[PDB]
């Protein structure tokens, strides 16, 4: 069922941090668009647009880091340990969380949270 | 290479009328015109296959369409005059009260 | 214009004609065929005429009421001599009379 | 089922087709040299 | 015993007085409505019960042919 | 073109084509054994067999060229 | 807009259309390989599913 | 010639009563004579007598509708699904019917012309339910549809039904524009738009290796646009605001027949043809995002028409998962869930549109009336019971499918997420009857009775809606009908 | 060639349909846009559609429009905003669909490449279909009134739907 892969753990993070990244730029981008103008802004469209751009870069390099934090503890924690199971992951899920996620809120029961929703949801696959 | 061209043509009127849609926040007079394209860009997709194939079903389809784009701007614009009448102004801020 | 009055589901009573002409379905009216014509129109008028007593319209109410209750008795009769012809619903009488004439 | 498609309900186009298969606007064009 | 027409009965006669007490009315407002509503809850329930009738007979024809079409797959 | 109009007033190009295949799988309880006259239906509507062809002798062409 | 606006727009649409041309060409061009990959994946496939039932 | 008809009796019929009722309100609405009269209820009343005389001619004519099939085939197909779908459609326009006329007297809405658009709708989807091709699919839904924005906008000097009507034909042209598309790819990829010439050539394959795109997303596009009309998340965002900004009797209507209608064209376009996997997983990922979304929002909403919008939108996710398992108890799961959520919302909206003479909008309105009108509160107490699915009420049968499926078809997360959104649904109603009974507000609304029709429709459903578990064989062995007669 | 002439100009009228500030010249680029659709019918040899589409679209549905928009005397102040923030999401929406729409032909309908050798001699003629052809007009004709006329009266009941509605929703009566 899983026998079409050619792996490398480092290949796999850095395929993570730039799935992430794309993911998180497309994300930054719909956000960015969702959002009206601040009102000082209606009459001038440049402005406007550096908003959404840095939305874009700074939803992008969340993503990325969550992206590739997360398999590369996942592997991390495989190789050293070397046995394949959900728990393998569970653990890269909560750092990921944890760490990327209470960086950007500032607050440690954000990063709890965030790392016990990750793991549990890495832990149903 | 026709067969391409043409489809292109009308995939090109189809995506104008979705990028109407995205550019016009503040003009939904526009929407109902981007609408309208992505409805001619269908109907030119059903004479061009139909073109292609040697089947007349394509046709028959084309002008029933037809019918139905001039049924549905002549309701959208009597929505939007009602619309105007009511409220003095088309802008969409006017036109967001019920919500959640 | 190719016609074919062939049904989807077989008529499970003996077919005493396969597309019976308008004015033989109509001459099948038995009893039971004019007495839902007029119990529908006659439901028809009535309704028509309870309902046009607000407006002030009673009469005229009645008119269009009555209009299409025989319109739907009318429909739902020939319906049942059509069926009962073509062998759809139990034609006792239909056999009866076309295995004499 | 095994061959939905086999049933009758689902062979209408094969009967009525071949009614209308000598109507003006679908017959084969030396059908009108011969006939 | 327990007849459909004794349940369509009751529960015509129930429906009068539910509705009379929706609208703050007293339970036997009009109670001719009361005789009529059991007659057609009467008659509702017997037909309701030759309906289930011819409805399994149906069911039963419909997953004779079901059956069938299945068994064929093994010849 | 499974109706058999033409947009000329005659049988449709593919119509044939349609109609041996409809009657393939009227009878034929297992879609695989009409598979030929299905892709024949399709090249039919499309084309894409015949010009891919033509398009190896145009390359080959070129290639030789 | 100017006229010669519309007009520098419509040359500009020229060009593009032009170049979706020589896109089509190229699609067109590389049927064959396509269609040699999908012989690969699709056997591989095959071969796949024939032995992992010899088990 | 004239016999090859009787398979149209019922809509001949319904449009020439339709056309007659037309031309009776236009004269005698303009008469000076008659003082101008409002004819809103007597046209009212003969257009349900209307209805009622077309549900005979097509109940008592089931073998008839079937007679001439082949020369009607390439228009539209009736059997016995079609015929069973366009009875229940009659049956829900009748009683919507019935519950306006308290509406039409009181507001003094007196424009005749919504019961002419009213069965011209019905019409549009009695041809909707046996259409058998793309052309007639969408002309059918195209005529469904225009009635629909004309009557979303029928308060015309009001902001919010002007609102609802504007969002609607922009939404609704949208999305028709998206199937139209999708239509167009498929007719360019196979050549055919009839149901039977797309089964013949879709089967067998699905996707094998070399799948037509142009198939697959005409499939897509289609799709969107059938999701768009079971407001399925995430193309749902139009019923709230078209259900809360339309005159009640229309939010009534819109609630339960256009969904009987999409239903039978969804069935009959996708359970029939055959793409496969794909089309399931659209509808299963849709179910999913339905419960959960309609669930956190009806729990934020303060108004009982949003409430209720929400309510739908997370039962047509419960419904959807039926049509997602793709086997014959997965389509007669769907087809019961949708009668039991008719009825169900037949209850609620003639509760409703019985408050509404009052002018219910908050759920805190409800509070005390208990007390002020106690058969009421325990009769709209029920109906939210069944809503929340305890047994042994009806709502239950539907619930006890989605937890059947989802240990049936193999899927847990789905079962979990039934799990969560059930309790959070129990929540938000229970809300309700926390509202009517326990809480003692410092002011009352008095509400003012209710008209008969509501009173007897009322009662009816709420008996339908305690005692169906105890014979519940009818329904149950129509619906397997159904799910049988669409293949045999 | 001339296909990419008729695809510029309808392009470039189609963005000036979305982007033109006044909205009565944004249904004038419109007219140009059914125009150039008209040119193509021509190019396709259905001239009924070619005229349909003159007569119709333009003729009386694009009058409508215009009446409406000038009548309603709209200021560029109530539906003006600035674009330039929709280019990062326009670019990925429009690319989306272009790489998988404007190519959705390519695998099914594949072109055939133009070669040098006159393959124009291998066309082959059946001058049976040509003794007594037939026009777009009669060929659609054969068909809309007797095999599909339910679809022809449905659409009737659409039209009708629309006259009602149209006087319903804004008829006020002197």
Same mark, same amino acid.
């Given at each position: 069922r899983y026998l079409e892969e050619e792996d490398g753990p480092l290949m796999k993070t850095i395929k993570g941090s730039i799935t992430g990244f794309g993911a998180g730029t497309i994300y930054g981008t719909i956000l960015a668009t969702?959002?009206?103008?601040? @009102?000082?802004? @209606?009459?001038?469209? $440049?402005?406007?647009?550096? &908003?959404?751009?840095?939305?874009?870069?700074?939803?992008?390099?969340?993503?990325?880091?969550?992206?590739? !934090?997360?398999?590369? !503890?996942?592997? $991390?924690?495989?190789?050293? &340990?070397?046995? &394949?199971?959900?728990?393998?992951?569970?653990?890269?899920?909560? !750092?990921?969380?944890?760490?990327?996620?209470?960086? @950007?809120? @500032?607050?440690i029961?954000?990063?709890?949270a965030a790392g016990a929703t990750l793991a549990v949801t890495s832990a149903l696959i | 290479m026709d067969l391409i061209k043409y489809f292109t043509f009308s995939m090109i009127i189809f995506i104008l009328g979705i990028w109407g849609i995205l550019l016009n926040r503040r003009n939904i007079l526009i929407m109902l015109m981007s609408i309208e394209l992505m409805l001619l860009a269908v109907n030119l997709n059903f004479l061009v296959f139909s073109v292609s194939l040697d089947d007349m079903m394509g046709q028959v389809f084309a002008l029933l369409v037809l019918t139905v784009a001039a049924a549905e701007s002549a309701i959208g614009l009597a929505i939007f005059v009602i619309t105007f009448r009511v409220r003095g102004t088309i802008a969409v801020e006017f036109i967001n009260s019920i919500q959640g | 214009m190719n016609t074919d009055i062939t049904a989807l589901e077989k008529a499970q009573y003996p077919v005493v004609d396969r597309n019976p002409a308008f004015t033989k379905v109509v001459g099948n009216f038995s009893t039971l065929d004019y007495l839902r014509f007029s119990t529908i129109t006659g439901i028809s008028v009535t309704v028509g005429y309870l309902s046009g007593i607000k407006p002030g319209i009673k009469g005229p109410s009645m008119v269009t009421g009555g209009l299409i209750g025989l319109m739907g008795g009318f429909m739902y009769a020939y319906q049942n001599s059509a069926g009962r012809l073509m062998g759809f619903f139990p034609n006792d009488g239909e056999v009866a009379s076309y295995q004499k004439r | 089922p095994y061959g939905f498609w086999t049933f009758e309900r689902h062979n209408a186009q094969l009967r009525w087709d071949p009614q209308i298969s000598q109507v003006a606007g679908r017959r084969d064009p030396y059908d009108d040299l011969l006939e | 015993p327990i007849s459909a027409t004794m349940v369509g009965a009751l529960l015509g006669l129930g429906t009068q007085m539910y509705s009379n007490a929706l609208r703050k009315l007293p339970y036997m407002r009009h109670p001719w409505e009361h005789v009529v509503g059991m007659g057609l809850g009467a008659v509702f329930a017997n037909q309701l019960v030759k309906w289930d009738v011819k409805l399994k007979e149906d069911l039963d024809v419909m997953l004779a042919k079901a059956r069938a079409a299945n068994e064929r797959r093994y010849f | 073109m499974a109706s058999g109009w033409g947009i000329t007033g005659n049988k449709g190009r593919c119509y044939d084509f349609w109609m041996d295949f409809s009657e393939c799988m009227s009878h034929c309880r297992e879609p695989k054994d009409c598979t030929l006259l299905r892709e024949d239906y399709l090249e039919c509507l499309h084309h894409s067999k015949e010009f891919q062809r033509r398009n190896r002798i145009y390359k080959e062409e070129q290639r030789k060229l | 807009v100017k006229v010669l606006t519309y007009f520098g727009m419509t040359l500009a649409a020229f060009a593009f259309w032009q170049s979706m041309d020589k896109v089509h060409v190229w699609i067109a061009l590389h049927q064959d390989e396509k269609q040699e990959r999908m012989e690969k994946e699709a056997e591989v496939r095959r071969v796949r599913a024939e032995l992992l039932r010899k088990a | 010639m004239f016999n090859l008809f009787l398979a149209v009796f019922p809509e001949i019929f319904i449009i020439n009563a339709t056309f007659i009722l037309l031309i009776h309100g236009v004269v005698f609405s303009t008469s000076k004579k008659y003082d101008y009269p409002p004819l809103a209820s007597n046209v009212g009343w003969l257009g349900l007598l209307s209805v009622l005389i077309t549900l005979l001619l097509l109940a008592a004519g089931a073998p008839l509708l079937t007679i001439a099939h082949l020369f009607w085939n390439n228009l539209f197909r009736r059997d016995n699904f079609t015929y069973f779908c366009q009875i229940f459609l009659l049956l829900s326009t009748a009683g919507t019917i019935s519950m306006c006329f308290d509406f039409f007297d009181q507001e003094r809405f007196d424009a005749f012309e919504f019961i002419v658009l009213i069965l011209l709708s019905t019409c549009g989807m009695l041809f909707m339910i046996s259409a058998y091709d793309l052309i007639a699919m969408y002309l059918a839904i195209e005529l469904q549809s225009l009635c629909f924005y004309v009557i979303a906008a029928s308060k015309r000097k009001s902001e919010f039904s002007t609102?609802?009507?504007?969002?609607?034909?922009?939404?609704?042209?949208?999305?028709?524009?998206?199937?139209?598309?999708?239509?167009?790819?498929?007719?360019?990829?196979?050549?055919?738009?009839?149901?039977?010439?797309?089964?013949?050539?879709?089967?067998?394959?699905?996707?094998?290796?070399?799948?037509? /795109?142009?198939?697959?997303?005409?499939?897509?596009?289609?799709?969107?646009?059938?999701?768009?009309?079971?407001?399925?998340?995430?193309?749902?965002?139009?019923?709230?605001?078209?259900?809360?900004?339309? *005159?009640?009797?229309?939010?009534?209507?819109?609630?339960?027949?256009?969904?009987?209608?999409?239903?039978?064209?969804?069935?009959?376009?996708?359970?029939?043809?055959?793409?496969?996997?794909?089309?399931?997983?659209?509808?299963?990922f849709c179910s999913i995002a339905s419960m959960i979304l309609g669930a956190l929002a009806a729990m934020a909403q303060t108004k009982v028409k949003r409430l209720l919008a929400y309510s739908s939108i997370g039962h047509?996710?419960?419904?959807?998962?039926?049509? /997602?398992?793709?086997?014959?108890?997965?389509?007669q799961s769907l087809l019961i869930g949708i009668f039991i959520y008719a009825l169900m919302t037949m209850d609620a909206f003639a509760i409703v549109l019985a408050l509404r003479q009052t002018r219910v909008k908050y759920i805190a309105d409800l509070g005390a009336l208990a007390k002020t009108n106690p058969?009421?509160?325990?009769?709209?107490?029920?109906?939210?019971?069944?809503?929340?699915?305890?047994? *042994?009420?009806?709502?239950?049968?539907?619930?006890?499918?989605?937890?059947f499926a989802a240990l049936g078809c193999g899927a847990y997360f789905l079962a979990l997420v039934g799990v969560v959104t059930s309790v959070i649904g129990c929540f938000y109603y229970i809300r309700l009857v926390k509202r009517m009974f326990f809480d003692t507000p410092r002011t009352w609304i008095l509400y003012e009775p209710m008209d008969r029709n509501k009173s007897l429709l009322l009662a009816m459903t709420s008996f339908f809606i305690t005692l169906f578990l105890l014979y519940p064989s009818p329904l149950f062995s129509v619906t397997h009908q159904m799910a049988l007669s669409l293949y045999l | 060639m001339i296909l990419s002439v008729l695809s510029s100009l309808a392009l470039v009228s189609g963005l000036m349909v979305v982007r033109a500030k006044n909205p009565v010249h944004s249904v004038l680029f419109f007219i140009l846009v059914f125009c150039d659709t008209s040119?193509?019918?021509?190019?396709?040899?259905?001239?009924?559609?070619?005229?349909?589409?003159?007569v119709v679209y333009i003729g009386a549905i694009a009058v409508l429009f215009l009446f409406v928009v000038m009548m309603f005397h709209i200021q560029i102040a109530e539906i003006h905003e600035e674009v330039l923030r929709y280019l990062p999401v326009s670019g990925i929406i429009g690319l989306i669909f272009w790489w998988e729409m404007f190519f959705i032909l390519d695998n099914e309908s594949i072109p055939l490449l133009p070669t040098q050798r006159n393959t124009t001699s291998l066309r082959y003629t059946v001058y049976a279909g040509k003794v007594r052809s037939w026009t777009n007009l009669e060929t659609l004709g054969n068909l809309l009134y007797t095999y599909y006329f339910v679809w022809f009266l449905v659409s009737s009941l659409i039209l009708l739907v629309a006259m009602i509605g149209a006087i319903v929703l804004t008829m006020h009566r002197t």
């Amino acid at each position: 069922r899983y026998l079409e892969e050619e792996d490398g753990p480092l290949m796999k993070t850095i395929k993570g941090s730039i799935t992430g990244f794309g993911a998180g730029t497309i994300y930054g981008t719909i956000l960015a668009t969702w959002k009206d103008v601040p @009102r000082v802004e @209606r009459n001038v469209a $440049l402005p406007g647009l550096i &908003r959404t751009l840095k939305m874009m870069g700074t939803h992008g390099l969340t993503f990325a880091a969550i992206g590739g !934090v997360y398999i590369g !503890v996942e592997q $991390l924690v495989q190789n050293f &340990r070397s046995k &394949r199971d959900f728990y393998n992951g569970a653990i890269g899920g909560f !750092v990921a969380g944890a760490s990327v996620l209470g960086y @950007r809120a @500032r607050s440690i029961p954000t990063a709890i949270a965030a790392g016990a929703t990750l793991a549990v949801t890495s832990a149903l696959i | 290479m026709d067969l391409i061209k043409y489809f292109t043509f009308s995939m090109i009127i189809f995506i104008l009328g979705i990028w109407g849609i995205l550019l016009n926040r503040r003009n939904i007079l526009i929407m109902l015109m981007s609408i309208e394209l992505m409805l001619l860009a269908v109907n030119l997709n059903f004479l061009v296959f139909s073109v292609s194939l040697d089947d007349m079903m394509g046709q028959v389809f084309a002008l029933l369409v037809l019918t139905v784009a001039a049924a549905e701007s002549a309701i959208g614009l009597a929505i939007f005059v009602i619309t105007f009448r009511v409220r003095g102004t088309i802008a969409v801020e006017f036109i967001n009260s019920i919500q959640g | 214009m190719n016609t074919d009055i062939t049904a989807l589901e077989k008529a499970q009573y003996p077919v005493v004609d396969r597309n019976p002409a308008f004015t033989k379905v109509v001459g099948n009216f038995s009893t039971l065929d004019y007495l839902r014509f007029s119990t529908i129109t006659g439901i028809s008028v009535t309704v028509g005429y309870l309902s046009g007593i607000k407006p002030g319209i009673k009469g005229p109410s009645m008119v269009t009421g009555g209009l299409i209750g025989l319109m739907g008795g009318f429909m739902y009769a020939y319906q049942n001599s059509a069926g009962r012809l073509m062998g759809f619903f139990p034609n006792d009488g239909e056999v009866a009379s076309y295995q004499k004439r | 089922p095994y061959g939905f498609w086999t049933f009758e309900r689902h062979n209408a186009q094969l009967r009525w087709d071949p009614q209308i298969s000598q109507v003006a606007g679908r017959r084969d064009p030396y059908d009108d040299l011969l006939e | 015993p327990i007849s459909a027409t004794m349940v369509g009965a009751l529960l015509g006669l129930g429906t009068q007085m539910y509705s009379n007490a929706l609208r703050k009315l007293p339970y036997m407002r009009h109670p001719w409505e009361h005789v009529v509503g059991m007659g057609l809850g009467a008659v509702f329930a017997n037909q309701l019960v030759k309906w289930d009738v011819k409805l399994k007979e149906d069911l039963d024809v419909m997953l004779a042919k079901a059956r069938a079409a299945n068994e064929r797959r093994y010849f | 073109m499974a109706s058999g109009w033409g947009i000329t007033g005659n049988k449709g190009r593919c119509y044939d084509f349609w109609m041996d295949f409809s009657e393939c799988m009227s009878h034929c309880r297992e879609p695989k054994d009409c598979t030929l006259l299905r892709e024949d239906y399709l090249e039919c509507l499309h084309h894409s067999k015949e010009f891919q062809r033509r398009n190896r002798i145009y390359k080959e062409e070129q290639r030789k060229l | 807009v100017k006229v010669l606006t519309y007009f520098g727009m419509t040359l500009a649409a020229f060009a593009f259309w032009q170049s979706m041309d020589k896109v089509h060409v190229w699609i067109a061009l590389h049927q064959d390989e396509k269609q040699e990959r999908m012989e690969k994946e699709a056997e591989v496939r095959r071969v796949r599913a024939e032995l992992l039932r010899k088990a | 010639m004239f016999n090859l008809f009787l398979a149209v009796f019922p809509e001949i019929f319904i449009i020439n009563a339709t056309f007659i009722l037309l031309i009776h309100g236009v004269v005698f609405s303009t008469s000076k004579k008659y003082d101008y009269p409002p004819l809103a209820s007597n046209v009212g009343w003969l257009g349900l007598l209307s209805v009622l005389i077309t549900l005979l001619l097509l109940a008592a004519g089931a073998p008839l509708l079937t007679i001439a099939h082949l020369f009607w085939n390439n228009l539209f197909r009736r059997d016995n699904f079609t015929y069973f779908c366009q009875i229940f459609l009659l049956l829900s326009t009748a009683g919507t019917i019935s519950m306006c006329f308290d509406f039409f007297d009181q507001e003094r809405f007196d424009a005749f012309e919504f019961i002419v658009l009213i069965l011209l709708s019905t019409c549009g989807m009695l041809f909707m339910i046996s259409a058998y091709d793309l052309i007639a699919m969408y002309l059918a839904i195209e005529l469904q549809s225009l009635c629909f924005y004309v009557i979303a906008a029928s308060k015309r000097k009001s902001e919010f039904s002007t609102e609802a009507g504007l969002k609607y034909l922009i939404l609704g042209a949208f999305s028709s524009g998206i199937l139209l598309f999708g239509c167009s790819m498929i007719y360019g990829s196979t050549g055919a738009t009839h149901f039977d010439q797309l089964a013949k050539i879709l089967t067998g394959y699905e996707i094998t290796g070399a799948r037509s /795109s142009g198939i697959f997303m005409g499939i897509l596009f289609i799709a969107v646009g059938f999701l768009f009309k079971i407001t399925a998340v995430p193309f749902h965002m139009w019923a709230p605001d078209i259900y809360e900004g339309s *005159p009640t009797p229309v939010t009534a209507f819109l609630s339960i027949a256009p969904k009987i209608s999409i239903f039978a064209n969804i069935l009959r376009v996708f359970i029939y043809g055959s793409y496969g996997a794909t089309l399931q997983q659209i509808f299963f990922f849709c179910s999913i995002a339905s419960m959960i979304l309609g669930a956190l929002a009806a729990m934020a909403q303060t108004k009982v028409k949003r409430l209720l919008a929400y309510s739908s939108i997370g039962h047509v996710g419960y419904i959807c998962i039926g049509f /997602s398992c793709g086997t014959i108890e997965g389509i007669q799961s769907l087809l019961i869930g949708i009668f039991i959520y008719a009825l169900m919302t037949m209850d609620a909206f003639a509760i409703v549109l019985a408050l509404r003479q009052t002018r219910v909008k908050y759920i805190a309105d409800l509070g005390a009336l208990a007390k002020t009108n106690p058969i009421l509160a325990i009769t709209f107490s029920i109906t939210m019971f069944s809503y929340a699915g305890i047994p *042994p009420l009806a709502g239950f049968c539907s619930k006890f499918y989605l937890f059947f499926a989802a240990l049936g078809c193999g899927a847990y997360f789905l079962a979990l997420v039934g799990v969560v959104t059930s309790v959070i649904g129990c929540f938000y109603y229970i809300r309700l009857v926390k509202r009517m009974f326990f809480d003692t507000p410092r002011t009352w609304i008095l509400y003012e009775p209710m008209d008969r029709n509501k009173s007897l429709l009322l009662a009816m459903t709420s008996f339908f809606i305690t005692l169906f578990l105890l014979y519940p064989s009818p329904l149950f062995s129509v619906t397997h009908q159904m799910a049988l007669s669409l293949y045999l | 060639m001339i296909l990419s002439v008729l695809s510029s100009l309808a392009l470039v009228s189609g963005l000036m349909v979305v982007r033109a500030k006044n909205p009565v010249h944004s249904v004038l680029f419109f007219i140009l846009v059914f125009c150039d659709t008209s040119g193509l019918l021509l190019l396709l040899g259905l001239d009924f559609f070619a005229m349909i589409f003159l007569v119709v679209y333009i003729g009386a549905i694009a009058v409508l429009f215009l009446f409406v928009v000038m009548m309603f005397h709209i200021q560029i102040a109530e539906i003006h905003e600035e674009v330039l923030r929709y280019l990062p999401v326009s670019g990925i929406i429009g690319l989306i669909f272009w790489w998988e729409m404007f190519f959705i032909l390519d695998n099914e309908s594949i072109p055939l490449l133009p070669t040098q050798r006159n393959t124009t001699s291998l066309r082959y003629t059946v001058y049976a279909g040509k003794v007594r052809s037939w026009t777009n007009l009669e060929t659609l004709g054969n068909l809309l009134y007797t095999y599909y006329f339910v679809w022809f009266l449905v659409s009737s009941l659409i039209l009708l739907v629309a006259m009602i509605g149209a006087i319903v929703l804004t008829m006020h009566r002197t």
